[PDB]
Design a protein around this ligand. Structure first.
Ligand code: L9R
Ligand code: L9R
Ligand code: L9R
Ligand code: L9R
Ligand code: ATP
Ligand code: ATP
Ligand code: CFF
Ligand code: CA
Ligand code: ZN
Ligand code: ZN
Lengths: 694, 146, 49, 48
């Protein structure tokens, strides 16, 4: 592996048909027999690993202990028609058959899988690197064909990205994707987050912020993977292990509890349909269930208590699953503004940003970067702004002990962490907790869950309050949320047109009070008239209440204008109120909703169209890549796959800095400097070497 | 075929066959496709309509029951909101189909302590159910044509 | 998928499909890794025939 | 009709230069080429 790593280092910054790459191919050809032997070592045991697990092989295994004789092994392998004569004999020699010629094929298959994995992957990378940089060498395809199984095995783990290197050229980087990283990336919650992120940047995002948003998405996704790993499952100590297990259970099953609460709400409201009010006890009336089974009344009490418990568990499930991301994001953006902007050093927000003013409480807290990965943000800010703003003033702002900086760098102290609850009392950063709770209390999702719980408790005072919970279907079902989004999309316009409706009706009221009052007698009685327009407030209410809701406008409600001096004036008043209010203004309200359906629909189409016509990374259209058959499909899955950039960032974090290659160090340095110039923009490997590749 | 055989038991079953024009004529099938294109959304908004009407029923049963006497008779009242199931049916049956919402059907709220509360109940039910929710149903069909 | 298991061993499985030698091709492709006798049992094939 | 007019105006400004009329696709050969072109090379404010 170390020799191959040296060979891969010689290929750093190597152009297509480079002299070093062609020399390396000649070196492999000069030692072709040895290379074939090495490749024949890897595929034989990779094939052996899957053969022993095959159903046909198990038919030969007859020993109850799980062993197999050499003669039985001999007839098992040649029945697969995958190995030759000498190959089977070599496998027999490698098998540690006992004095009874019995072979433990379980350990035999797994004996070399782990020791030879690192070298096998690097050989696959070496052949892949040479093939893509010397594509017109007939001598190299022979090695690729002989290593087809090795390449196929490591295909899901061989990640490749393209970057703009320091040499002002597009370079292709090959790295390793671990099994855990790919498994976590394929989780449905992570995939849903990716779809939401893609929709946001394509719809309401810019080109200059596209890569910075993408990196921020990667940082959030990595943090969420840690949370999922922590909550996953395979006297103080006894309770703590059960407490975290209980909390993890709620975090894992947060959405099922949300569904369960919605189900219980319908069950409670179904029972409430049987309520009946009667003067007689089961001049005040009594409200009681009316059913013959006799089990619904106890069931309502049981469901009401159960619903309250589930709602309470949702809050605990939420603050252990979603709150850490909220704190992580807020700490992340605050730290960068402290360093790269000097938010509380230079600009000092002008009291109109409640978010900025609230974050002042956490600057001097000893545990400010609790969720954010960078634990040395204060150290970095001090080195950047200390000279221009004052080291002692920066330390006071960030709550840093300057005298403690050196002693920590000198040696390390190991104190006594007493596992007592009393010692745990004063170890709580009260100021940080106040800041953290303020962030949680300003979260829309947490406030909704809090309202759901409060309503559940009010349900115990009157059960009818459990009706409010049936609203949850607004966000419980995504189909309704999309439908309701068609109402809230133009919500501001809907409010204004209703306000405009109130003003136009007031103008009609003023005309009526002044000129048409006699026609507003709404009493069939003859000696006591119920005049509806003897007061402006009463007449305005009359127009807004019965006038708007009437099919034919105000004219339907008011007395006939026939045989009267003002008949023509009243026909204009009635027809104009019908047109302007009933016809035009109600069409605007309906028109806004209909237009919202079209506007939301094209946003989905626009996002889908952009993803299938342009690359998310380089921005080059699919038309250019389609010169080569299936060019755009291969480009978005192999060359500029956005998932590989996610994996490459995780690869750099786990890998030791001393082991970073020249290309890896270049990208890693720019990640720490927040410079996204390594992302290819408007260029790709295929475009840079069009003459050589074609 | 089954409906044709049932037609022999009662000839009126032969009416079902007139539905065939849905696929017999391609023009109608395209028109009907504009309804089934957003059929799932149409079902959900009707379900949403049932939930919003239930919330109005709960408010009525609790606070506005006196106004639900639908009997011109004076000694035997036909109270429509003395039971939740009856009151919910009343809102779903006459309330939704009324042009001006529930207010048109129920007794006038004038000269009463809860008059302002009842005007908000009547105007909001007109806006949310008659105006907004029926526009969504019509909006889904219109959007499907586009 | 579960309903199609009834037709795998039927003597006239490719009645309408033009390829009448699908069973022969499947046996040659998966017989070595899954067992020729087990494939024949699954597809209702007589190896001696 | 009014909605697409706003979209058309916004789309044209973000896809073509107001001065030379060359599309953003040509300038995007260079990373952030169109952004620099509309802020440094052919900025309409500089002509003012
Ligand atoms: C008010 C609803 C808030 C949310 C509105 C959305 C829901 C739409 C409609 C829902 C239906 C509501 C049920 C109404 C029927 C209840 C009748 C009743 O019990 O009326 C209650 C009135 O009491 C109350 O008002 C208590 C409620 C406190 C304040 C109510 C406001 C809710 C606060 C909301 C919390 C956060 C809200 C902020 C977010 C805004 C909304 C998102 C009287 O009893 P009762 O004595 O004779 O018996 C009790 C039996 N014993 C007395 C014998 C024990
Ligand atoms: C005379 C013809 C003018 C009517 C033109 C209508 C054009 C729009 C005008 C609207 C306001 C009309 C006020 C007229 C000013 C005074 C007229 C006069 O000389 O007044 C005339 C009476 O003529 C009339 O009856 C005019 C009747 C007007 C009815 C027109 C119906 C149109 C309603 C339009 C509602 C506006 C809402 C628009 C919303 C826009 C949404 C898109 C004689 O008085 P007077 O000695 O008995 O003592 C006034 C009475 N007070 C003692 C109370 C002061
Ligand atoms: C039920 C319709 C099924 C399809 C609905 C879509 C059509 C929309 C409406 C169509 C109009 C239907 C005509 C109703 C009037 C019939 C009155 C009548 O005869 O009512 C019948 C009721 O009997 C029945 O119900 C028999 C029918 C069996 C079950 C009916 C359900 C139909 C089964 C559907 C088969 C597959 C359906 C699955 C797909 C779902 C739909 C796509 C009674 O007689 P009658 O005794 O006095 O005389 C007979 C004269 N002698 C008795 C003297 C002989
Ligand atoms: C008091 C003002 C609160 C009204 C604010 C309305 C805002 C939304 C609230 C809706 C539910 C109202 C319940 C109020 C809680 C109890 C109030 C109270 O203290 O109750 C007050 C009475 O005040 C009232 O009359 C309030 C009347 C509310 C009418 C508001 C009409 C709006 C209808 C909205 C329908 C919701 C559907 C929304 C769908 C959304 C679709 C987009 C005194 O009791 P109580 O001693 O006689 O014994 C309670 C009676 N029981 C014995 C039966 C328990
Ligand atoms: N750089 C890119 N990386 C990945 N996909 C890209 C890129 N540029 C454009 N795309 C397009 O994004 C589309 C979305 O990816 P795709 O649908 O294959 O993802 P998935 O992981 O299989 O799951 P899902 O269907 O949920 O998105 C692809 O069809 C591809 O054409
Ligand atoms: N010649 C040009 N000069 C300026 N902007 C141009 C030119 N051609 C195209 N544009 C586009 O016009 C858009 C509008 O400019 P921009 O939004 O940056 O202006 P502003 O002064 O910051 O304020 P505002 O957001 O109110 O327009 C830019 O995003 C740019 O892409
Ligand atoms: C989690 N994480 C990052 O997400 C990260 C990083 N350096 C840069 N980034 C983006 N480090 C060191 C890190 O631990
Ligand atoms: Ca090194
Ligand atoms: Zn690309
Ligand atoms: Zn220009």
């Amino acid at each position: 592996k170390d020799m191959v790593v040296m060979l891969l280092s010689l290929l750093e910054g190597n152009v297509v048909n480079g002299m070093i790459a062609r020399q390396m191919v000649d070196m492999l050809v000069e030692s072709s027999s040895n290379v074939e032997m090495i490749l024949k070592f890897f595929d034989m045991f990779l094939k052996l690993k899957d053969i022993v697990g095959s159903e046909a092989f198990q038919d030969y295994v007859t020993d109850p202990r799980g062993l197999i004789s050499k003669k039985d092994f001999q007839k098992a392998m040649d029945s697969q028609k995958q190995f030759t004569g000498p190959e089977i004999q070599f496998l027999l020699s490698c098998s540690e058959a006992d004095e009874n010629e019995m072979i433990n094929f379980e350990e035999f298959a797994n004996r070399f899988q782990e020791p030879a994995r690192d070298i096998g992957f690097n050989v696959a990378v070496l052949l892949t690197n040479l093939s893509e940089h010397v594509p017109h060498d007939p001598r190299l395809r022979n090695f690729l064909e002989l290593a087809e199984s090795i390449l196929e095995y490591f295909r899901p783990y061989l990640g490749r990205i393209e970057i703009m290197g320091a040499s002002r050229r597009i370079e292709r980087i090959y790295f390793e994707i671990s099994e855990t990283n790919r498994a976590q990336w394929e989780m449905p919650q992570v995939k849903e987050s990716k779809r939401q992120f893609i929709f946001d940047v394509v719809n309401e995002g810019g080109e200059a912020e596209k890569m910075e948003l993408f990196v921020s998405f990667c940082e959030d996704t990595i943090f969420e993977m840690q949370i999922a790993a922590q909550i996953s499952e395979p006297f103080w100590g006894e309770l703590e292990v059960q407490r975290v297990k209980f909390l993890n259970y709620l975090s894992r099953n947060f959405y099922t509890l949300r569904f369960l609460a919605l189900f219980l709400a319908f069950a409670i409201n179904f029972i409430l349909l049987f309520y009946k009010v009667s003067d007689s006890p089961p001049n005040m009336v009594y409200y009681f269930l009316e059913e013959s089974t006799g089990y619904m009344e106890p069931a309502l009490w049981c469901l009401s208590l159960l619903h309250t418990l589930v709602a309470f568990l949702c809050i605990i499930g939420y603050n252990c699953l979603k709150v850490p991301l909220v704190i992580f994001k807020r700490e992340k953006e605050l730290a960068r503004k402290l360093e790269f902007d000097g938010l509380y050093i230079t600009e000092q927000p002008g009291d109109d940003d409640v978010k900025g003013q609230w974050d002042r409480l956490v600057l001097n807290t000893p545990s400010f970067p609790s969720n954010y990965w960078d634990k040395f943000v204060k150290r970095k800010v001090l080195d950047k702004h200390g000279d221009i703003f004052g080291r002692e003033r920066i330390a006071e702002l960030l709550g840093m002990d300057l005298a403690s900086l050196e002693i920590t760098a000198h040696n390390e102290r190991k104190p006594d962490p007493p596992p007592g609850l009393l010692t745990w009392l004063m170890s709580i950063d009260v100021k940080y907790q106040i800041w953290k709770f303020g962030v949680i209390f300003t979260d829309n999702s947490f406030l909704y869950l809090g309202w759901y719980m409060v309503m559940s408790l009010l349900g115990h005072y009157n059960n009818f309050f459990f009706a409010a919970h049936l609203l949850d279907i607004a966000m419980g079902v995504k189909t309704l949320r999309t439908i309701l989004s068609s109402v809230t999309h133009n919500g501001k316009q809907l409010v204004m047109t209703v306000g405009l409706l109130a003003v136009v009706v007031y103008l009609y009221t003023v005309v009526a009070f002044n000129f048409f009052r006699k026609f507003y007698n709404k009493s069939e009685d003859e000696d006591e008239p119920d005049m509806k327009c003897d007061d402006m407030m009463t007449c305005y209410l009359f127009h807004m209440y019965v006038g708007v809701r009437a099919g034919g406008g105000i004219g339907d409600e008011i007395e006939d204008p026939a045989g009267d001096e003002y008949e023509l004036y009243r026909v204009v008043f009635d027809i104009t109120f019908f047109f302007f209010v009933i016809v035009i203004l109600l069409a605007i309200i309906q028109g806004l909703i209909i237009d919202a359906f079209g506007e939301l629909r094209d946003q989905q189409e626009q996002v889908k169209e952009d993803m299938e016509t342009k690359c998310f990374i380089c921005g080059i259209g699919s038309d250019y890549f389609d010169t080569t058959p299936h060019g755009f499909e291969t480009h978005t899955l192999e060359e500029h796959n956005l998932a590989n950039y996610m994996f490459f960032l995780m690869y750099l974090i786990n890998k030791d800095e001393t082991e970073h290659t020249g290309q890896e160090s270049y990208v890693w340095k720019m990640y720490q400097e927040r410079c996204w110039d390594f992302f290819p923009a408007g260029d790709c490997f295929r475009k840079q070497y069009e003459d050589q590749l074609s």
